[PDB]
Subunit: 400 residues, 5 copies
């Protein structure tokens, strides 16, 4: 319209985008800054980078861009692109994007009295410390620091407004505990003037159903399956195969776990402790199985069972576990030959009895170690899992 054209022509006369729009030069310009979170796109733990979608909110007052609406009956607000108006240089300090600024430059909407709004959208990638000590039951706090780059405290007065989460779209993996903000003032080695900034601390909680049913339960099941090696009879020579293949499955699971975790040396993660405990238990079970097989195949005349071992294994541990241990001239020549055969059979019977005793001792050791290893596995698993904080509330929120 003619009035719009006239206003647009009159508004830009003698205007200078480099100038701060203040009536008095020695007074700071107040700028209100706020943030609107729409979605959390990614939390990369290996690279420790948070990718979110946010709209910035910058509102201030322009002294020159004012007019009387009576003289311009139709128009009420105007709009200016980048480069034709003065804008604050609000930047994210801890950005991780290759381009340090990742905001789409939209229009600035101007009031009939000079008020200016600026709502640029953006996919922001920032670097925040990520703690994996209590993984997967962890809670993360990532900071977002915004501030003016070249305007101090005596030039641009930054004020904070509470963040907006009405448009938030819930994420599948991460809950949103919340985003509080605070305004701080700092001194930099460059200069001798305070530089205010606004920091929003996004606090999220990880939902644990996926990891719990994909990574924890299989490990428990395989660890419990590794205990069947103590139930197999020694004659069926397939004990080392069982133990070593369970160990192989466990170590490939360990590699799968480690491929998604950053190589930080602050502390030992909970799942790392879990996998170490499972590794140790399976290795000890393999060692015990080797000892049991050594007992089972003992050479009957190789040696004698020591008295202490005989007592401990035969009369005490069997009592504990309620196990019962099993069990005419020509005539003389024929006589001595059949006597020789009978003596040979008697010696064979004694050797068999000794072998049976050794086999029973092996079975007793096997059962005792089965009981001990089951108790160890249960106690270690329960302790490691319940050591983490907020585990109860994570379980209650996710699995129930």
């Amino acid at each position: 319209g003619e009035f719009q054209r006239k206003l647009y022509k009159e508004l830009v006369k003698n205007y200078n985008p480099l100038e701060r729009p203040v009536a008095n030069d020695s007074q700071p310009l107040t700028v209100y800054f706020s943030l609107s979170l729409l979605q959390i796109m990614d939390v990369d733990e290996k690279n420790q980078v948070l990718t979110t979608n946010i709209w910035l909110q910058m509102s201030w007052t322009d002294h020159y861009l004012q007019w009387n609406v009576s003289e311009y009956p139709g128009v009420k607000t105007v709009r200016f692109p980048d480069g034709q108006i003065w804008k604050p240089d609000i930047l994210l300090y801890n950005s991780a994007d290759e381009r340090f600024d990742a905001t789409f430059h939209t229009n600035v909407l101007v009031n009939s009295s000079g008020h200016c709004q600026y709502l640029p959208p953006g996919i922001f990638k920032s670097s925040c410390y990520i703690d994996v000590r209590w993984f997967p039951f962890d809670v993360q706090h990532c900071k977002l620091k915004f501030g003016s780059w070249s305007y101090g405290g005596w030039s641009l007065d930054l004020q904070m407004q509470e963040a907006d989460i009405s448009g938030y779209i819930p994420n599948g993996e991460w809950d949103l505990v919340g985003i509080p903000g605070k305004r701080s003032e700092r001194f930099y080695e460059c200069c001798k003037e305070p530089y205010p900034d606004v920091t929003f601390t996004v606090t999220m909680r990880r939902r644990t159903l996926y990891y719990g049913l994909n990574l924890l339960i299989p490990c428990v099941l395989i660890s419990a399956l590794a205990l069947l090696v103590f139930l197999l009879p020694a004659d069926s020579g397939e004990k080392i195969s069982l133990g070593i293949t369970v160990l192989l499955s466990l170590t490939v699971f360990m590699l799968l776990v480690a491929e998604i975790m950053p190589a930080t040396s602050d502390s030992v993660p909970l799942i790392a402790q879990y996998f170490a405990s499972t590794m140790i238990i399976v290795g000890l079970s393999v060692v015990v199985t080797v000892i049991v097989l050594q007992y089972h195949h003992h050479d009957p005349d190789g040696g004698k069972m020591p008295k202490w071992t005989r007592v401990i294994l035969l009369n005490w541990c069997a009592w504990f576990l309620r196990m019962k241990r099993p069990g005419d001239p020509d005539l003389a020549k024929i006589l001595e030959e059949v006597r020789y055969i009978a003596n040979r059979f008697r010696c064979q019977d004694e050797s068999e009895a000794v072998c049976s005793e050794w086999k029973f001792a092996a079975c007793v050791v096997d059962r005792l170690c089965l009981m001990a290893f089951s108790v160890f596995t249960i106690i270690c698993t329960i302790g490691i899992l319940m050591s983490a904080p907020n585990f109860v509330e994570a379980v209650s929120k996710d699995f129930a």
Copy 2:
């Protein structure tokens, strides 16, 4: 020509590209918006991003860009590049691209009476919720929300038109169901003026032939092979090794499947339930194999067969399964020797009888568990596979 040159020179006289091309400033400007889909290029479930190829269609009326064809006989339409004509700032709200605007700026074609058309092509990436509860028999609805950033409802009148899919190129993995659209207007915390927007909901269905052939058939066949352990004689030791190798194969298949799936905790996927059921069945098979092996290698004099075990296995189940039950002084001194030899043979005889009885019990247990596990696996796989909605439709559309 001279007419074209003069018309271009005249049409830009006192033209401000910063004003809405309207005759009456109070009245809004109507802009017709539409979309033209060309190809659905990618659907990333892990990152939950939809990548498509679309042409936007914007149509409006410019009041200043009008002329008489009689004065310029040759010229009928003109073309204005980016930055020299007023264009709506319509963009995608939910964009998952590093640059928030992924459209290609092209010329605007202008009528002889002020009708401007704008057809910018683009490769658009958006973030939409991906539901994997019914993988692979799932249907996805992804929303594209377009709107003007800085023009409210009192200055811009966004009117929806119907999407065009006449040039759509079918995809080899996703079968397009449709793409309806709807207009809405919302209130934002920024301001006190309604803002309209247009949302197009792409509804698509996944073709399941590839997944059904490459992922479900191998698992079914491998689980069926896992049931061969109950048909394997216990004399040859190959049962534990076979079962554990099948377990390893299931583990690698599970990791391969989980490599491509989102780590969400909204619900337990159907494929995850299927894999868990198969894992449990194979683990129970290994446990039963251990029990049968322990029964078969039972030492003869190490105990007596319980009456309950006898009455459960040796008679009842054998009847039900129709398995037949398999069954001068020297003239003195030589006599006790031959009696000793005969008695030793007799003792060996009834020991062998007891061992044969135990082996028959083991065979009975093997047959029982074979039947039970076959029934269980068939029921479980059929129920899990058929529990998903629109599964018969997917089968009848892909396989037949």
Copy 3:
């Protein structure tokens, strides 16, 4: 020089880069379009994207860029950069690049009579359907569709010229069959004016030496090795281990091939059919091995061999394979004791004979299944490989 400076000053006088350089505003402007292929950079089958290196070739005639060479001695050609003279807005419709234009804007060479040439180099990513039905003996036709975006048939008359391949650099994996071109005009839902375009079809063939030697032959030897299970004697307990290990290796190969191929449900790939056949054969071999082991370890007193089973296995198949089937009062007490031992030995001998007969039947079944499986796998592999079209051409070209 002075003449060059004068000419450059005169040419840009009153020149508008927005108008079509035509003497008459009604007649269309003829533009000659051509392509120069340099290399086939990539063919992503999984994403279905063709990346090529090409020089476009646009030629037209400009009415305003003319001068008399006599008045400007020495200068015979001028050059104008991007944004100072009119250029066609020719784009690639099938672009899969994040930016719809992947051309490098070079200079425009202008004649002494107004003939303008424009050869912008570029690396182009386009979307074409990659058929994988006959992997790896397949031929691909990928389309590159170029056209003007905002100029209709009444303004820009597009013309086609034969593509140039004189600078083609041969690719190590693809053989260029050819690159024909066609010109068509289509009607779009936007407007009521035809829009001409030029489509170039790149037809190329895949060389099948790498795949044949790395992926098909090793599977053939693995399948052949799987047949050795029908030669191991049953006493050596390794048949199940061999079969299951071969099956695991085949599954690993299956995952390796599956991770490069698209997830399309359009058709069943030939390689998928071939691997499915190999896996089915191996599984059937494992089942047959289980049956043979069950026959071999038969209880001597379990059950008599059926008459039909005897008359078949021990006679018909036995003759077919030309294998022959193997084959004083104390004196009374002494006699009665010796007779019992003799009778026990006789019973043992008869049981041994029965066991030997069962083992011979198992061997017969083993050899019969060996012959059957070898024939079946040979014919299946030959048929699947030979079913592909141009298989003979591919093998001849890539091997001989």
Copy 4:
């Protein structure tokens, strides 16, 4: 300063950056072109690209940018940024980057006498054919082609200078042999105008210590370990597991090497034929092991051993291999039973004496195949490794 301010004001007066700075328009402009390499950042064989760090060097003479130093004391050189003075359009033809140009436009430094110098830096990404025939002992020649895009020899005649490698930073994998340059002069069919271009050939030699220590040596060790199947006694049923597990390790190594290799079908690479030979050797070892196991477990009465098998294995191969051949009325009825028992024992001993011959034949075949396979693997490995032309150079430079 005022002097350089006045100089800058005077120089750009009536200056056209589109004009070729030559005093005489008929004469062409001499441009000296050179390259300075700093680093071979990457050599990708799968994608066949070369990434290097390069400073270009362009030198020419300007006719209008000249001044007298006496009139402007203290000013000897000036500097002009991109887009304000004429610059050559030299480009790299065989580029492999999404943007065709990969240079960083720096300033142009200018003489007091008009000689212009220009040194843009860049991370250049070109495409060259990477031969892989003699991998790892391969030498690569990659060509960089530079030329003007729209200037001929009667407008701009390119010259040469030797490439500078004084600042080259040695790479840890590739050894630089040289960077020779060739100046090509192409003629068209229309015109006698030369067209000069400059091509630089980077010659690189791969340092093979890493590959020879991580791929060749472990494969040799595992293949040698695979030869122990001919040393294991057949009684311990573990002759098949060794071979199958070694074959699985070989397949894993083949997958590892195939992950990094291009899919070109130009020739069979050295590492590929090496792994094929090892595959064949292992498979033949498994077949021989099956034959030996068949010999060992022969039935005692399943058929007389062939005369040829006797006369060869038991005599000739035994002589060669220096292995020796290992090795009242009731009283009559009592007599009959004792004779029966003795005859049974005689028959058992005679039958047992037959199996010893089969076991000895198995041992003979085992040792003979051991020596044969040792010779085979040694010959194949030595020949395949020494077939490369650079083997001696590589082993004398890297390992020594």
Copy 5:
């Protein structure tokens, strides 16, 4: 404000952003350069690049941009954007980014006396040589080389200020040691003028808790478990299975380690030496196991034990290891038929004695090799781990 509006109008009057802002053109302009480090974002060992977050700091003095604060009250500083005032062209030579300059162009702040400050932020990708010989216990020195591109001695002399690390954010992987810098002069053959540059050497120490808990310890544990083959009785067919399964775990773990190393042939890394040592240890263990099994299953009448072998393995080593050495006519017919049985039993007994001697010799060999390998592996591991510098500091810092 009117004062700053007038000041901004006055400052840019006759200002040329091309000339060097110095009062006397014969004197160099002093520029102070430094940087502030914020974070070490990534250290890529495979690609040999270093990603850091850095704020440059360049300060100088401008002769023209000066004013008296009395005439413009309330205005103390001004801000100019890129392209409106002169700035140094300081770049980083070691850049590894696609765009050579990765800095972000912010405003330049000018005081009342003409002092100019410029602090652009950036994420810089440098290319520094990474020495991986002592990995994990590694210390890295990475150089950043900053300098002007087209300014020399009497044009611009660069001066150093100390780097600032007061804002450094600790990394969980690398422990920063220091960032010492150096100002260096390069002299040309042209003329006596220094060319200054500034080099900053970042020294980082890797924190080795993650690697020591994920690579070294599990390798030690599995290698120790590989020694259990020397405790398994030979009667259980699992020695080869144990050894080769441990070998498989070792080789897959080696492949994982090689996935993260760079393919540099300058030196052999510590972890590679350790893995090779474990390879040889396990292979020799397998060979010894084969020899022991060969001794165990020796034919009783296939050859007497050599005298040397007897004296070595039955007296000397047995006393060393303290192993006990393990454990009417018819009557004539009866006599003859009984003597046969008696003599056969005696022959069986003596053959059993020979077999027992062979088995005891095998056990002695097994124990000897157990002790030898147990010493060897400990010695090799301790030596390899302790052969690295700063190992004691690394453990005492990371672990304790």
